[PDB]
Design an enzyme around this catalytic site. Sequence first.
Site, PDB file in Angstrom:
ATOM      1  N   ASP A 101       0.864  -1.162   0.000  1.00  0.00           N
ATOM      2  CA  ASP A 101       0.000   0.000   0.000  1.00  0.00           C
ATOM      3  C   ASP A 101       0.914   1.229   0.000  1.00  0.00           C
ATOM      4  O   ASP A 101       2.098   1.125   0.351  1.00  0.00           O
ATOM      5  CB  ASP A 101      -0.878  -0.049   1.254  1.00  0.00           C
ATOM      6  CG  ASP A 101      -1.732   1.195   1.435  1.00  0.00           C
ATOM      7  OD1 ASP A 101      -2.469   1.591   0.500  1.00  0.00           O
ATOM      8  OD2 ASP A 101      -1.664   1.784   2.540  1.00  0.00           O
TER       9      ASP A 101
ATOM     10  N   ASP B 106      -2.144  -0.521   5.923  1.00  0.00           N
ATOM     11  CA  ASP B 106      -2.601   0.141   7.147  1.00  0.00           C
ATOM     12  C   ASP B 106      -4.099   0.424   7.147  1.00  0.00           C
ATOM     13  O   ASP B 106      -4.650   0.879   8.148  1.00  0.00           O
ATOM     14  CB  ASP B 106      -1.844   1.460   7.335  1.00  0.00           C
ATOM     15  CG  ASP B 106      -2.276   2.520   6.343  1.00  0.00           C
ATOM     16  OD1 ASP B 106      -2.534   2.182   5.173  1.00  0.00           O
ATOM     17  OD2 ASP B 106      -2.381   3.695   6.723  1.00  0.00           O
TER      18      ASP B 106
ATOM     19  N   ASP C 292      -6.937  -2.893   2.840  1.00  0.00           N
ATOM     20  CA  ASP C 292      -5.805  -3.815   2.708  1.00  0.00           C
ATOM     21  C   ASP C 292      -6.141  -5.172   3.326  1.00  0.00           C
ATOM     22  O   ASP C 292      -5.378  -6.127   3.188  1.00  0.00           O
ATOM     23  CB  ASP C 292      -4.545  -3.234   3.373  1.00  0.00           C
ATOM     24  CG  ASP C 292      -4.036  -1.978   2.672  1.00  0.00           C
ATOM     25  OD1 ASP C 292      -4.193  -1.878   1.439  1.00  0.00           O
ATOM     26  OD2 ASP C 292      -3.483  -1.081   3.354  1.00  0.00           O
TER      27      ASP C 292
HETATM   28 MG   LIG Z   1      -2.918   3.074   3.484  1.00  0.00          MG
END
Ligand SMILES: [Mg+2]
Lengths: 39, 268, 992
Positions: free
Chosen positions: C345, C686, C690
């Site tokens: 990410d 995070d 995700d």
């Molecule tokens: Mg992120």
Amino acid sequence: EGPDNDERFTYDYYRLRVVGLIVAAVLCVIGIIILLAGK
Amino acid sequence: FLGRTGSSWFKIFLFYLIFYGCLAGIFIGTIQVLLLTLSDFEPKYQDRVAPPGLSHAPYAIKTEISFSISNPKSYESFVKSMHKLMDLYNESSQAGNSPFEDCSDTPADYIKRGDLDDSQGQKKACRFSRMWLKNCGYAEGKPCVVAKLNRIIGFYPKPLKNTTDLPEELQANYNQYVLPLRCAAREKIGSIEYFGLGGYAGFPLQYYPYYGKRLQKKYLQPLLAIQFTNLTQNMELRIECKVYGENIDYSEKDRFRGRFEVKIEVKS
Amino acid sequence: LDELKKEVSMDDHKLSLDELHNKYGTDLTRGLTNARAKEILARDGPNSLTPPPTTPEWIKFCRQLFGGFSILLWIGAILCFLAYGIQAATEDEPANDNLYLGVVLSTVVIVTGCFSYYQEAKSSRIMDSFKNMVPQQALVIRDGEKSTINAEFVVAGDLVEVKGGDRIPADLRIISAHGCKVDNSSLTGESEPQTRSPEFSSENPLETRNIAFFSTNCVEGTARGVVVYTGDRTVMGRIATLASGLEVGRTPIAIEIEHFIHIITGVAVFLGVSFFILSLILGYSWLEAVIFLIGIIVANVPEGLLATVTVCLTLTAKRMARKNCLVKNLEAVETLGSTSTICSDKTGTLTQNRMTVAHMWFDNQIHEADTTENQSGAAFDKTSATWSALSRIAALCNRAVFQAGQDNVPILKRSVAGDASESALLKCIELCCGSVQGMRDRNPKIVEIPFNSTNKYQLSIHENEKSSESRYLLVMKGAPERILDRCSTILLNGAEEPLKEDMKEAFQNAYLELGGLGERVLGFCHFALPEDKYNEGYPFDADEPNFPTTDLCFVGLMAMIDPPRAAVPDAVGKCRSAGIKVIMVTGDHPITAKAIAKGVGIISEGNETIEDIAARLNIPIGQVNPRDAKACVVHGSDLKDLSTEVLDDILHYHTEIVFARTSPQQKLIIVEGCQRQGAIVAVTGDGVNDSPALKKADIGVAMGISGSDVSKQAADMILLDDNFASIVTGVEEGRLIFDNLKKSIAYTLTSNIPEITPFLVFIIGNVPLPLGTVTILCIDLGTDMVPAISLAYEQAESDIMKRQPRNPKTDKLVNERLISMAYGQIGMIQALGGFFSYFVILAENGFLPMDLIGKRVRWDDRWISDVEDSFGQQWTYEQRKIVEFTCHTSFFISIVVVQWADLIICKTRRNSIFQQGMKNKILIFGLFEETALAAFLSYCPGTDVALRMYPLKPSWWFCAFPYSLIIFLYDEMRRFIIRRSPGGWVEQETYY
Ligand SMILES: [Mg+2]
Ligand SMILES: *[C@@H]1O[C@H](CO)[C@@H](O[C@@H]2O[C@H](CO)[C@@H](O)[C@H](O)[C@H]2NC(C)=O)[C@H](O)[C@H]1NC(C)=O
Ligand SMILES: CC(C)CCC[C@@H](C)[C@H]1CC[C@H]2[C@@H]3CC=C4C[C@@H](O)CC[C@]4(C)[C@H]3CC[C@]12C
Ligand SMILES: *[C@@H]1O[C@H](CO)[C@@H](O)[C@H](O)[C@H]1NC(C)=O
Ligand SMILES: [K+]
Ligand SMILES: [K+]
Ligand SMILES: [K+]
């Protein structure tokens, strides 16, 4: 000795055990010392 | 193939052949040096045989010899081992002044044939007649057990002195020259009868010390025949034969350390 | 099952408000009926998420109790009770042997079960985190009246109302809104507020303004909407199910464990039954044939090995806990070392997740600011009088403020009330000009025009802090081009000057460059109003232009971006040097995604996309050979119409990949694509978007401070300080533990041979038993334990970060080379050293080696209390047994003595001990404690009963010394050959 050779069929397993246990303990302490040199 | 090519399969064989060959050659080398440090006449240690064991001829199934008097093949098993032992104490086996010697027909003192050396030939052993074993096919009824003290090189079995009290209190106490053997069971439902050298219930000290197989082959150890002409029948009787001496001790674990454990039962 | 959920969603934002009501039997104004709502409740079911069915811990524990070694140990334990049963019936055996050994072995299985159970842990509460995002209550309009209801009682069709501060209770079709902004970070990973209005604004429902989603929250304003989806049927409720439902799967390390279990189990059953029949042929009673088998089992199975592995893993996880890297699953300690591909990410992972000033354009010059958290860069300018003029506008023409009580925390980390751009500017000036509040106190704001959608600028009028003036200063900021159309002069190095086409062109150049860097650019200008035309009491009208807004002085430009975390660029390069492929997978827009890719080193300098080639050469993209482009940037909207085979080609054909504007399922798809090619993949993230990717990853790593609760539930590892450098450490630790496990496994296995061989020679030679079953357990469960563990503390023998990731198909944890060395070479030398001491003990007590062959028959005969030795002496039963058990004791001690050397040689696979040294203090500890344990077990009174251990004479200890030394020399010579010729012979045969 001659007829008085009783010592030939004898062994001080008691002392050997005392010494063996002393050694085992001291090796155990020595090990702690080296390990604890930083934790 | 499985793993590799033929060329690789070969090389892995040439390696392990030389490798294991070397290892075998090294192992043998260390065995050589071990043997080189040992005597031919005497073992390095003797503290593990120290207190002599007492063993008998009747091959006990489990420290027990039960059978039926009214049956032939009921005891023919115990007679096999009994024969095996006594067959060795034949007179035809003890011929000439070599390597046997006529010793006192009465319990005598020790005999030192020098040291544990080859500086002399085969150390001459005392003769022993199976004919000293009175009364004892064997006892088809009420067995005639044969006792024996385990051989130990350089061991001088020392009898107890009549200073204080004794089990067989002072009876026929040949204090100076006899290692006694008194069998027991309270529970006194038997009839102990002992046979041996000089008619004594012990081992004649003139057969000691033992010089070992290498310095004394054909050597004969003294026997002590014991007969239980018990007036009882059809019950397990725990009979313990005990030897007494200065160099004789016992253990709760080793039930053969200077003593017997016989469970006779004439179930007839 | 979940293949449906891996697809992009379909919606009804295209319908009119009225049309949408027909579909759901609803009223736009009155809302649903109390009766109709309750009807729909029973129909569709609750607005809730149901957690997936889990496997109870019962079945999880017991599943370990039947994995190769445990199976063999079970066969042993029962076979003990078998022989015991056969005894208790036949001849009354008052002993406890088979009974107790059967109890001991069954305990070994249970305890070993706990260790593997502890290792195979799965702490997963994905669906629980999602459930936390549904509010307890919602506001609905029913029978023309608004009431709060249990949010679970919400159904498709009712009229819902939301306002700033509340969570979207369900997927809504916006029908009415007033200044409504929403935080869609759940779906995008981006927290910038998105406007919501009734008007449809994109074909894509995840981008349109007239849809609001469950799992997000309203940030400001008010909105009303019609519920289109409820519970599991919402967009993120499906993501929830997808994430929670995904099959976990076996880790690389787990697969390795099972693999050597098969090997060792194989040789165990082989030799087991190979000698079971070999005994019956020799005329051994089944009574004995089973007793030998039990011994064979105990000899072949390394009883303490699986627990060693677990402890070595645990200890490695403890070290990483001490670098702010939390491991939730013990196996994930190794996966990072086997990782060949990282899918990362961007926002809050690679980046700080905070709009930060990156560059400034003043004095006809581009200046760069420091974007790093801890400010690890340098200054750009302080001297220029122009800077102070620009700095003043950035502070004054700004409505952002620091939250109360932050004075303790660093400037860049403190919470700010305001939009991202104003916060960035605030923190910029506060950093390099001190307290901004001071500047706003020295220059009192009298009138302002806040940033307007139409004006595209924000202006402010302040009392000049200067005493000699104390007059009125005008400042404004806005779109760079709009600010330009309002300027006549430029503050160059202090003094103003006319805005000639020259500087105007340099402005465009500066503007295009900064924008090309993916940075948001703002214009800044001011105007000192004429004193005579503006008295100290002159009133300014903000509603109607009461003051000039043209012919102003352009001061400068400022650019900003959500920047990389300081450690990220360097960590990315380090991953790439270790041969790990790094891919970006983000919900963010392509221009931003691509710019950070270059910033952190995902896309290296000079590498082009097909679009880059086309623009440079000024040719159509179809005219470009796509193989000429090693880099690519894929938008999610294009990803959607590509098959997996085509996704596989993208993955194969590019070294530098950026997946931008991806949905959560799309992240999962990219991860699966990478895995499909046979790669071990890590995910770093995070956000809740995700979660599926983190779950599917061989190892998911979540950020600890910036991470959402969901992401950290889906992960195997948490970076508690958001230190991306930890990934580099993790992969390094992972590789090190992999090598050290080999060392520890070889060490443990080596001692199997000296435990097997005595039992074999017992049969083939008919000699007294050299070593007992109990004695074996004193080794594998006792003495070898601490030494085997200590190998986990071994330093690397070379630069492990310099090698490529292991090939999980070829590079195994236990291979033929390990067995050859442990079983064929070193263990064989240990066996002999054991036997030697055995022959020494017996020969020194009167039984010379020659007379031992074929004596066991009379030796074991309990009724022969007169066995003749070599010297003609007669032994009772218990007497010779004491010597025999003393043989077991010295054979045991011989193993310990030969394991001394083995411990030292297993220290290194390649290097010499004279190179690696003896700096492992745990290892040395192992040596001392191992020897202490052995001595204690031999000399402690009473151990002759409980373990049949007998006191050894001093000379006995030294029997195996020459064998211990040969091991040290042999292995040292062998490894000397390895190093001296990287060719292959010694290497390809023995190199673990
Ligand atoms: Mg992120
Ligand atoms: C040792 O003495 C025993 C005494 O019983 C011998 O047994 C003899 O065996 C033969 C042939 O089987 C019989 O004819 C005799 O009746 C047995 N007794 C005697 C006194 O001769 C035995 O053969 C002898 N063993 C050796 C090796 O000489
Ligand atoms: C007690 C004694 C008699 C048993 C001796 C067993 C010997 C023959 C065994 C023990 C370990 C074995 C080796 C272990 C490892 C390998 C590597 C593999 O790729 C091919 C087989 C090979 C080379 C084995 C061949 C046979 C081997 C050398
Ligand atoms: C033993 O045998 C002798 C003959 O040799 C006999 O006189 C005696 O009765 C026997 N003794 C016993 C107790 O049966
Ligand atoms: K084992
Ligand atoms: K995972
Ligand atoms: K082992």
